[PDB]
Ligand binder design. Sequence first.
Ligand SMILES: C[C@H](O)[C@@H](CCc1cccc2ccccc12)n1cnc(C(N)=O)c1
Ligand SMILES: [Zn+2]
Length: 349
Amino acid sequence: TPAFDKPKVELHVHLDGAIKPETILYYGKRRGIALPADTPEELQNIIGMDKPLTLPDFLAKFDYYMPAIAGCRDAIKRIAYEFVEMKAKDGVVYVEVRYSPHLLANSKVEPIPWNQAEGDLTPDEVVSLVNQGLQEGERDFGVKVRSILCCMRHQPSWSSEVVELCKKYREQTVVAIDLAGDETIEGSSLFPGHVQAYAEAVKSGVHRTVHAGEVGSANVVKEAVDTLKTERLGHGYHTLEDTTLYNRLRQENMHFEICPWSSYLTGAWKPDTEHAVIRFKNDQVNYSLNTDDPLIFKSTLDTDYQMTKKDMGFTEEEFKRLNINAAKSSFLPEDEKKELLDLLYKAYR
Ligand SMILES: C[C@H](O)[C@@H](CCc1cccc2ccccc12)n1cnc(C(N)=O)c1
Ligand SMILES: [Zn+2]
């Protein structure tokens, strides 16, 4: 069944949206949280979309499982660990993965997320739990993993502590910053906390990626390039509505963070339009394929490569070119990059 079995690189996956069902019920009960169901195959069914939803509906999936993992140290540890393994199962030689460390904390975080009242688990050891899990996940599974931390659009307060965590846990294993949540909250790229965050990020050399152009306009994209100085773009579907911005982004090789299965299920793609990805194979730009949320979209990378495969005419020669593109645009230092490059050419030959 695989649409492409060569190795692949993936650059945009959300950790807290690639937890396993089996594991969430394990924790919801062993903590007394417990949740809408008890057999794995039916819980996956209530957390999981098959059909576009609204923002509250969507947001609410997160509401069911998250309280079962945030707070618990070995819930954190086990989720990063078990993430790597899913990506090993998946043909991936290199993954980058993101989360918000605040959204898994229960100490030193106003406000406390998901209704938890307090523990002692801060943002600081959530990273480091996560990255411990990712390191012995890497080592046991032979997948090279790095991590991105995400600022949240609605919460600029948290942003200086993001840039700061990035600097601290640099290398081991964090290599970039993100902006996530809903890009639709007016003026959000321009909130002073977010922008001083991204500026500290160019001051100290932290890589940058912003979610932009999924559901919001070409001006959130524009905001992200000219102001937040992104190096890459989550989705960016809406830069296509501005053809000088599109044309200039082709000219300077934007890397675009594509997630095509994810985008039917969200709404960002109306099925009766060009999928933005296809204009993307036709115009030969710099882009990847990406799963975004396995747990919620009931998917794996193969669902994305299948979907493109048979609905959109792509071939194995574009599937390679996109993976290499991915590797080039990854946030690896250039020595490790040329080595990831090498393995990929060899494999493709
Ligand atoms: C970044 C994280 O990894 C979470 C954030 C979940 C969440 C929590 C609180 C407020 C939010 C507001 C908007 C969207 C998601 C939000 N997350 C998981 N997947 C996505 C996505 N598909 O874009 C966002
Ligand atoms: Zn995303």
